[PDB]
From Swiss-Prot:
Residues of the full protein shown: 41 to 50 of 148
The protein, known as: Neuromedin-C
Its job: Induces an itch response through activation of receptors present on mast cells, triggering mast cell degranulation.
Modified residues (Methionine amide): M10
Domain of life of the organism encoding this protein: Eukaryota
Length: 10
Protein backbone atom coordinates (compact mmCIF):
# COMPACT_ATOMS: atom_id res chain seq x y z
CA UNK A 1 0.00 0.00 0.00
CA UNK A 2 1.17 3.50 0.90
CA UNK A 3 2.97 2.51 4.11
CA UNK A 4 2.72 -0.73 6.08
CA UNK A 5 5.65 0.02 8.38
CA UNK A 6 3.28 2.39 10.18
CA UNK A 7 1.19 -0.57 11.28
CA UNK A 8 4.19 -2.30 12.83
CA UNK A 9 5.09 0.63 15.09
CA UNK A 10 1.68 2.25 15.50
Amino acid sequence: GNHWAVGHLM
